[PDB]
Amino acid sequence: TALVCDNGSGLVKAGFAGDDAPRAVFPSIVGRPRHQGVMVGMGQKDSYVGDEAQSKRGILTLKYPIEHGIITNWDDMEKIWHHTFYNELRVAPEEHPTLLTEAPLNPKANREKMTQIMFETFNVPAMYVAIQAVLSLYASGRTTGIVLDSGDGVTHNVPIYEGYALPHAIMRLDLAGRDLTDYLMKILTERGYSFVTTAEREIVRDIKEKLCYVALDFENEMATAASSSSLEKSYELPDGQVITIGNERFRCPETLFQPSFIGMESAGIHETTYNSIMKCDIDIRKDLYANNVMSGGTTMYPGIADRMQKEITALAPSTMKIKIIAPPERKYSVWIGGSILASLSTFQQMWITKQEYDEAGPSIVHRKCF
Amino acid sequence: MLSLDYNNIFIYELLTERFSSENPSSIDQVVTDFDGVTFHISTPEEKTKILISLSMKCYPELVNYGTLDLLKQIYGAYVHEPEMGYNFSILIDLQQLPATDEEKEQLAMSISMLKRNVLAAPFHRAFTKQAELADLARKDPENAPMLDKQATSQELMAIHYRDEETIVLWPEHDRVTVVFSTKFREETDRIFGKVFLQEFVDARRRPAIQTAPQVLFSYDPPLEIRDIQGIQKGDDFGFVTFVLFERHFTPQNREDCISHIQVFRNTLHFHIKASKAYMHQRMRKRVADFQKVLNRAKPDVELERKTATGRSFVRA
Ligand SMILES: Nc1ncnc2c1ncn2[C@@H]1O[C@H](COP(=O)(O)OP(=O)(O)O)[C@@H](O)[C@H]1O
Ligand SMILES: [Mg+2]
16 A cells, blocks of 8 residues: 555554545654753653653653744754654555655745655655645545645645646745644633643643634624623633633634734735735636535534635625635545545556656755655 | 532521430521522421421422422431421431431531522533433534534523522533522612622632633623523623533532532622621721821820829829
């Protein structure tokens, strides 16, 4: 078999090509212990990865080696890929070709070092590195659409028409689940809930995943929260002490619609999809408006497909119908699209081969990946 | 006392006496309670048989919220026809008691607890219906918002339990909310009561009591009660809201939670009274400080020596 790895900024998804879901889903995290260590023989370990780092997190400095969709610590990403193959997926990468996955408008060197480590450290027979959002079209059984993809590190838009992408209309936004977690720590502080450590960052990520949703009309939910008894929710922390939050539940995701909440001068995700459609050729726009695909875990907020359908129908002309394709599986649709692409019967000529890398070096990736 | 008892102390002591007594005497005892409630305790046909009867101005509303079913479940075979001028009644026969001192004690407790048992039925209706909505929301989390929106109006209880308090409550899949539409008509208690209601809501914002029900306060009504008949936004009422979450009415805690929420405004009223005794001791302590500023105007003179009764003494 081939293997499919989606190198998420927050969360690794990994599995075999032709499977219907990832075999392994785990935190894109390396943990180093920050306290001294006093019990010899009791199974201390110099660093921890994934679910083990997430499980022992109280004594650890957790670090994400991907941020804003680029690898910023390659030594820790070699640990995450080693953990992916040998510990989590139980495979030798020496004999399976790997589909990797990458955000658009990344640094060229991110593509190069990612192909180099696969051939020169993991010895893979062949590899590829697909654009993250065109896989989410494959997962939906579809050759035309504009896809909003938002994971933990980046939000990006790719318009694609009849299997051809419009690369000048692609646009990227360095705001997704990480920034929404940081802004939830910022605004939990005003209820009196100080979260400060990179272990408490993960508690706030869980409060975000359990309690947050997006308002269909922000000023109407802000007015509803002025009589808050319906919007207040309690959450219990690991220590069994509890927090209760109200408008923090929808002020957090509204940063996607109003990036100025985190002081960021950019259009929201609704206006960025509209600006990406209006960058495309005039006769294709009708079919992109009808095919707004939503993907990645930052698209999982309750109310976000309705808020997106509303706020794009307020920008676009009323003469054509707009609908948001937000599957319930959409956290994994990037990986599902890679499972399709890596098993698809005309893709086997498109792999970067080991000999084909050995002839050219890591620059080979730019002349056949995209 | 820092906290009020939940039960009627007279009924508890009287039944704890008569359930032990070798020779019961007759009784004819009307007994008042808080919130305009009243009891009659008597031996109307034999010294052997005690009739306990409750009078309560909101009892017809409480019957609409399943009160007779709960009172039949609690008092069982002891339930009796209502006495004239009373809403509910129980007959206990002193030769028909349980076989143990501990069963007798919890029966004397159960009958003294009768005002909070008649008033508990709307809270048990909210807690048991929240468990239905919780199971339906656990079945389909995307249908739950519509179940909560309809239960906010179709499963709302209002009790006009005294002429200056309406308790309003409803279930939603993760909570019971209860609003006290609350007022003090006596003007010094309205002035001290503003301080009590303000510091009550600010207490819940501190780290030490985040484990408590969420509390909110205003003086217009919470959105979901604004059109309940007898709520009125200009009529000097404040509105204390408690959001009980699933952890506040867990099976180990339901009955203490019910007992303790019903007594909310009674503890506040009692402490507005007891604060005056505190202010009066605060005052007379610094009347005694101002004495020492006048005592320095007394010129120093030795008084003649006197015995303890004040009679003059002739030595030294
Ligand atoms: N139910 C959810 N509601 C809101 N945010 C979610 C939800 N589930 C996951 N997330 C967010 O999505 C992130 C992971 O999404 P994912 O698509 O896997 O991102 P990535 O591939 O870039 O790592 C989480 O770290 C969190 O910020
Ligand atoms: Mg991602």
